[PDB]
Amino acid sequence: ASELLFYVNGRKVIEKNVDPETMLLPYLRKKLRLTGTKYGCGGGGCGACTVMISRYNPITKRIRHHPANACLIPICSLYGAAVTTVEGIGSTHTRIHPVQERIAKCHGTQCGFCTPGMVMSIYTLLRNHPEPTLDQLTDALGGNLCRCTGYRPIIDACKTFCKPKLFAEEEFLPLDPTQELIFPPELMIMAEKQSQRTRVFGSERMMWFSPVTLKELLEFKFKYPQAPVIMGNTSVGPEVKFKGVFHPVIISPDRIEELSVVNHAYNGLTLGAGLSLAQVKDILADVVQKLPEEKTQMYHALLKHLGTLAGSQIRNMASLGGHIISRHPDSDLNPILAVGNCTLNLLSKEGKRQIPLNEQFLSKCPNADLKPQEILVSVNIPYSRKWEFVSAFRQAQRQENALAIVNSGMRVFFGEGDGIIRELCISYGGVGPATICAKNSCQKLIGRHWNEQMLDIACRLILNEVSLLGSAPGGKVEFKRTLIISFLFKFYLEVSQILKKMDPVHYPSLADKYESALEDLHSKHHCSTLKYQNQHPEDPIGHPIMHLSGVKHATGEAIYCDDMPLVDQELFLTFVTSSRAHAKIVSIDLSEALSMPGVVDIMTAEHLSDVNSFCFFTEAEKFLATDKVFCVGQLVCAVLADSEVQAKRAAKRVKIVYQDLEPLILTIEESIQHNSSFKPERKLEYGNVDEAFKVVDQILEGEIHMGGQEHFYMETQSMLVVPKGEDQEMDVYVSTQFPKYIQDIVASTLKLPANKVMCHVRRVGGAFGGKVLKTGIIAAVTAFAANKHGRAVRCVLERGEDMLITGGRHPYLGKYKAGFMNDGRILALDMEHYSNAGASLDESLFVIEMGLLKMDNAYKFPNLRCRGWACRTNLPSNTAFRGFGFPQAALITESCITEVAAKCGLSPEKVRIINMYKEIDQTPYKQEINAKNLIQCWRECMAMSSYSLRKVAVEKFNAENYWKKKGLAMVPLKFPVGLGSRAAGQAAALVHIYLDGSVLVTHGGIEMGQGVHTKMIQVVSRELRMPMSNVHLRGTSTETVPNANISGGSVVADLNGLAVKDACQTLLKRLEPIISKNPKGTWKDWAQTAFDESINLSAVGYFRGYESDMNWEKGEGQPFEYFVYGAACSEVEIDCLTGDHKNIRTDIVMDVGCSINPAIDIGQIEGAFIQGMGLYTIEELNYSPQGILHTHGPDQYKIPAICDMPTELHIALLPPSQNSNTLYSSKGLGESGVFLGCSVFFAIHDAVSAARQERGLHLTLNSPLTPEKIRMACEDKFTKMIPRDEPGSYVPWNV
Amino acid sequence: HGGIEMGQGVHTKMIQVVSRELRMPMSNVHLRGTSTETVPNANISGGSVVADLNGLAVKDACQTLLKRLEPIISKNPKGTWKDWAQTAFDESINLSAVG
Amino acid sequence: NKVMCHVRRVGGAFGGKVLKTGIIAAVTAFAANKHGRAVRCVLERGEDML
Amino acid sequence: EAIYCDDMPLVDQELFLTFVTSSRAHAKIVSIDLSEALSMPGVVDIMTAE
C-alpha cells in the first residue's frame, strides 16, 4: 500500500493507490496539466516527449541528470526522483531560459510541436556540460526529429553555447549559473535515510514490486519467475504497446549497487547489468584512452556501434543487461559480444553461476539460457591479445537512430610466427529471428592465411551457412546477402592493412584505389551561409521578424488541440480499422467490447443510417465500411468510452470476420491490367510530336517509378467536439487546414444548417496537405457521437493508426519516349503519367492535372504530348501533399533528361542548359512567361557553388577511389503558382480597432508553422502605421470569417494578406479626416475621436482572387499568376560496398520576389528541401502482398534527422524584381523547394554512374534512392556471387 | 450585434429584421450571443433604445448584402438562398457585411 | 485586444448589472491572472442586495 | 436548456471567489487579520487593497 512520491518542476507529487500502468507522458498532460511535453510517436524515436530525470546517489554525494522519453517511463519507477519538463526551466510569466530564448529567436521553430523536446535535450546537455562542443549538442539531438525547419536554425542556436544575419546573437541572455534549478532538498533527505524497504503498488490488473536490495530482488525473481525485470522499459514497453503483450506482475529494482559495478581487472572488464548504454559508452571511451590499442579491441568495436545506437534519450534509459537479455535480432551490441568470449555473471537464491555469451544463449536454448529465477548481475568483456583484431559493421536506412538491416561482429586471432588463422568468429544480426554465428564456416577457415583465396572461400561458405529464404521477414533479401559478404570484405581489408603495418615483410600492400573502403562516411561539421536583401524604420515588411509564437513554442505555452483542458464529462473516441485490403465483412461482434469498463457506445455503418455518406467532389462515399472493405486502415467501428485507455482496450476486443475478395490490386501496373471501365483522360499537346519523331537523330524509351510519402506532421490528427446544449449548436476544435469543410461535413452529418456548426483553429502542428479530407471524416463521426450522447468528445490518433488512416503522397509511374538531337535538344517528348490513387480517386485527378501543367519545369519542349491517369488500388487513399504533383512530374522529366544525356555523351547539366526556356518563351499550355530569373538563378548557383571546379575534383576523386564515389548534380526550378479558378483564390479578413488604440485581426488562413499570422501582423503594422505590438490575433474561426478557402496551394499568406490590407485601407480612409486635424496624435486619440464622431472602427477585408483559367479540352489557358524560379546544386559521397551515402554540400538560389519575411521564407526553403530530400532518398513505405503496411523493425519509416542534413548549406535569395500583381511583389515559397531535394537524388545517380562506368556496365534508378537501391546498382564480384531465388517460387515480405 | 438580451426580446426582434430585409424565414437565421470579439465598441444595453439602434445596424448590414446580390437575384429570381449564396461565392462576391 | 467579454443572455438586469459588475469582474480577473486559474464568482441574494 | 452564466460547466481546476464586505456605515479599518482564514481548507489566496 505504498505511496508514490516524486517531484515535477520542483513541486512535490504524491499519489495514493497509484495505478502501476500509469505512464509519465499522459500523467504530465492530463493529471498535472503540463501540456508542454508532446506525443509524437509513442515508441521513443522522435523525442517530442523528452524530459530530464534527476536522481541523488547518497553513497557518492552526487546528483546526476539524464534525458529520457516520457512515453516509456512508468511513474512508479520515479520514486524519489525529480522530473523537469519544458515548463520547469522557464516561461513568459517568470523568466525565459536562454535555451528557450535562443531556439525561438534563431528561428528554430515553425509549427513548434517539436520545440519542447529540442529544448529539453539541449537543456539537459548543458546541465551536464556547461561549456560544450557542437558535437556534444548535435549528439544530444540525434533522437530529436523535426519536419519543418531542416535543423539548420536549431544548430545555430546550439552554436551560440560553444564559441547580415537573421538574429542578433549579442542580445541574448547569458547563461546564468545562479539561476539553475535546485535539486529538491526533500529527495536528498530521503536518499540519506537509505531505506531497505521494498515498495509495492498494485491495481486489479497489475502488481508492481520495487526491491532496493539485492536480496529482495532475488526473492522476487524466485517467487515470480515469469515477471519481467524492468530497467529502462525500452524493450518491454514498446512490446506491450504495439504487440498486445501484458505482464500481470512487474519487478523493477531501484539502484542496486551490485548491478552498477565497474571492475577494471587484469584480464578484462566487468560491467554491471544495471548500467545504462550511455554510461557504458562513457566507461569504454575512458578505457580506450588510458589503455594501449592492443588490448582495447572489443571496446573500440562496442564504442563504434554505441555511437549510432538510437538517440541520447534511449541510451540513457536502456540498460546493458536489458540489451543482452532482450536478444533483439537487430541488436548492434550482441553480435560484437558474441565474438568476444564474453561471460555472464548470474545470481539467484541458490547462488552464483557463470555462463558464456554464445550463439545458443542468443537463440534462447534453455540449456544455455538463464534459469527462470536467475538475474543477470554483470558481464565480463576480455582484453584482446596481440595479433587479435575485432571489427563491427552495420547498415541501416539512416546513419543514426535507425534499426540495422544487417550488422556484424568479427574477430580473428593469428599465431605470432605463422600468420595462420588460429581463431575466427563471425556473427550477424538482422538476418533471422536471433543473432547467428557462422561457426561452421569459421572452423573450416581455421589454419589458412589472410589472402585472396581465403576470402573467396569464406564468402561462399558464409553464404551457404547464413542463408535467407526469399520470404524472410524484413525483405531486402538480395541486399542482406550482399551486405553479409561486403562486411566480410571490409573486415578482410581492415585486417590486411594492420597486418601489413605490423609485419611488412610477409604481406602485400593495399592498392591505392582500395584504401578509402576503410574510411566510413562521417561528419558533424554542420556549416551554413545565408544571403538576402535590405522605407521607414517602423515598417516591418521585409524584416526577419520572429514567428509570433516562437517563444511560446519554446516554453510549451502554445496550445495545440490536444493541449486544451478537459471539458466537463468529455468522452473519447477511437476507431477499429480494417485489417484486409479487399474483403467482405461477414460479421461484426460487439457483445464483449460493449460490456467492458467505461464503454458508452460503439457505432458501425448502420448506426449512422443515412448520414454515413457525403459528396466530397463527384460522388458520395462512406465514412464507415458497410459490407466490404477496400484497403487496410479503412474505418469500420467507432468506440466511445469514458477514457482513452478504456476505449482502446474495448476496441481490441471487437471481433470482425473477413472473407477475402479477388482481385487484389496493389500496383499501378496491376491497376491498368485489371481495369476495363472508362477513365477520364487528361492531355496536353504542343507542337506536333508525331511529325517530330521523323527528324530526330535518336529515340529513347524509358520509365521511372516513384514511391509515396507520409506527411509525418509531428502533431497527429487531433480534435475536440463540444455541443453547446442549445439549438443543437456545435463547436468543433480541430487541427485542420480547411475549417469551412469541417463545418460543411459536420453540419451535413448532423442534418443542421451551417450557422449551427462553428470550427475554431488557433494553430496546427504541421499539416503539409494531410489534414483535410479524412480530418473531416473523423470530425463528422466524432460530432455524430457527441450529439447523440450530449457530451464533448475528443479524438486523437496514435502515430500507427494515423499513418494507416490518413494516406500520403501519390506514388507515380512515368513513361516517356524522347526524340533528341545528338547535342541534347529534345525536339519531341511523348510522356505518360500514372498516379497510385488508393481506394478513392478524390484528389488524384487534381494532382494529375497539376502534374501535366508543371512537368515542363525549366525546359522548352517544342513538340510535346503529355497524358495522365489516376489508378485505383486496394491501398489507403492518397491525399494532397506539399508540391501538388510537381515533385513527381518534374523528377520524371529530369530522369528523361538524364537518360538523354547518357546517350549524347554529355553531362546532364549541359543537356539542361540547351533545353532551358529562353528569356521570353511560351509554355505547353500557351502561357507567355518571362524566364530571366530562371537563367539568373542557374548562373548564380553555378558561380556561388563553384560547380566547374568541384566537377573536376569529383572526377579526380572517382579516378582514385574504387569502393567510394562522389557525385554532383544541379537542377533548375520553375514552380508556377495558381489555383484553378478565381473563386478558389478569394480571401477575407475582419479587423477591429478598440478605443484604447489596439487592434484585433482575423482572417481565413490557418497557421501550420509557415508563419502566416506573423506576416499578417506585419501587414497591419505597415498599412495602419502602428507597431506590431499594438496588433493581436487569436485564431481562425468560421464565426468571424465565413466561406474561407482551403489553407493550401502556396497562396495562403498572399491572398489573406491582400484581404487584411483591404480592411486596413478601409479603416484608414474613414480616419483620414481625424488624422488630418491631429497628425501628432496616438492611435488611442484617433480611435476615441472616431467613436465620438460616430465613425465605425470595424471593417471586413475581401480579395476576389487572381484571375486563373484552364481549358483542358483545348489544352490552353492562363492558370498561373506567377512563377517561383530556382536552382539547386548538391554533392554526395556513396559507399559502394554498403549503399550508405553522405550529403556533403548543397547550394540553393531562389527567386522570391520581395520577401515579406526572409527568416520565415528561408525557413520555408530549408524545410521544403529537406522534405524533398527524404522523399527521394530515405523515406520508404513497405507494403506486403496482402496490402498490409509494415511498420516494425527495419521497416520503420524514417524522416531526415540531423545526420541527413547536408554538412554545408548555402542559400541565397535572388535580388528582387517588381511583381505589382502580388502582395508587396512577393511570391509564395511554401511548396517550391521540395523538388530541389532531387539534386541529392541525381548527385547519388552521378556517383553510381561513375562506379558503373569504371566497372564497364552500360541505368534506371527509381525513387526513393535507398541504400538498398544504391548498393545493388554498384555491381561487383559480390553482387554476382550471391544466391538468387526463382521469382514466383516464394511469397515475399514486400512488393 | 452589440445589444444584450436580458429578457426584453431584442434578439427575437433582430431576426425579425433579418427575415424581412433578406426575405427569408426566421428559421434560416440564427444568433449565438454578444461578444467584443465580433462587434467592437458597443454602447450600453440601456436607455430604451437597444432594439431601436441595433435594429438599424442589422438592417444596414442586410441591405449591403442584398445590394451585392441584386445582379444574382435578377438572373435567378426563383432560386433559393442556397443557390444565391453559392453563385455569389463562385462569382467572388463577399457574403460578410458589417452593419 | 487581450480581453474579450462574451454574453449569451442575462436573467434580468433593469440597470443593475453595470458598474459593480465591472468591479467584481476586475477583481475576479486579477485573481484569475495571478494564479493562472479560471475563477467563478456568484453572489448570494443577501450580499447581492448589499 | 437555456444556459445562464452560472449554468456553464465546471472548467478544469477553476477556483471560486467570495467577498468580505463592510459591516460599518462610516468607520476606519484599524486592522485586518487573515491568519486564520488563510490556513483554512481550500484557501488559495485572500486579497486586500494593498
Ligand SMILES: Cc1cc2nc3c(=O)[nH]c(=O)nc-3n(C[C@H](O)[C@H](O)[C@H](O)COP(=O)(O)OP(=O)(O)OC[C@H]3O[C@@H](n4cnc5c(N)ncnc54)[C@H](O)[C@@H]3O)c2cc1C
Ligand atoms: C526507439 C528505440 C530505438 C532503438 N534503437 C536501437 C538500435 O539502434 N540498436 C540496438 O541494438 N537496439 C536498439 N533499441 C533497443 C534497445 O537497445 C533495447 O531495447 C534496450 O537495450 C533494452 O534495455 P532495457 O533496460 O530498456 O530493457 P527492459 O525493456 O527494461 O527489459 C527487457 C528484458 O530484459 C530483461 N532484463 C533486464 N534486466 C535484467 C536482469 N538484470 N536480469 C534478467 N533479465 C533482465 C527484462 O526482464 C526483459 O525481459 C532501440 C529501442 C528503442 C525503443
Ligand SMILES: O=C(c1ccc(OCCN2CCCCC2)cc1)c1c(-c2ccc(O)cc2)sc2cc(O)ccc12
Ligand atoms: O608464410 C608466409 C609467407 C609465405 C610466402 C610468402 O611469399 C610472398 C610472395 N613471394 C614473394 C617472393 C617471390 C615468391 C612469392 C609470404 C609469406 C606467411 C604469411 C603469408 C601471408 C600471405 C599469404 O598469402 C601467405 C602467407 S603471413 C606470416 C606471418 C608469419 O609470422 C610467418 C610467416 C607468414
Ligand SMILES: O=C(c1ccc(OCCN2CCCCC2)cc1)c1c(-c2ccc(O)cc2)sc2cc(O)ccc12
Ligand atoms: O474545395 C473543395 C471543394 C470545392 C467545391 C466542390 O464542389 C463540389 C460540387 N458542389 C456542387 C453543388 C454546390 C457545392 C459544390 C468540391 C470541393 C475541397 C473540399 C470540400 C469543400 C467543401 C465541401 O462541402 C466538401 C468538400 S475537400 C478538398 C480537398 C482538397 O485536397 C482540395 C479541395 C477540397
Ligand SMILES: Nc1nc2c(c(=O)[nH]1)N[C@H]1C(S)=C(S)[C@@H](COP(=O)(O)O)O[C@H]1N2
Ligand atoms: N511548417 C510548415 N510549413 C508548411 C506547411 C506545414 O504544414 N508546416 N505546409 C506547406 C503547404 S502544403 C502549403 S500549401 C503552404 C501553405 O501556406 P502558405 O501558402 O502561406 O505558404 O505552407 C507549406 N509550409
Ligand SMILES: Nc1nc2c(c(=O)[nH]1)N[C@H]1C(S)=C(S)[C@@H](COP(=O)(O)O)O[C@H]1N2
Ligand atoms: N425582461 C426584462 N425586460 C427589461 C429589462 C430587463 O432586465 N429584463 N431591462 C429594462 C431596461 S433597464 C431597459 S433600458 C430596456 C433595454 O432594452 P430595450 O432598449 O430593447 O427596451 O429593457 C427593459 N426591460
Ligand code: MOS
Ligand atoms: O497546397 Mo499544400 O495544402 S498540399
Ligand code: MOS
Ligand atoms: O435605461 Mo435601463 O439601462 S437603467
Ligand code: FES
Ligand atoms: S519519443 Fe515519445 S512521443 Fe516520440
Ligand code: FES
Ligand atoms: S517546428 Fe519542428 S516539427 Fe514543426
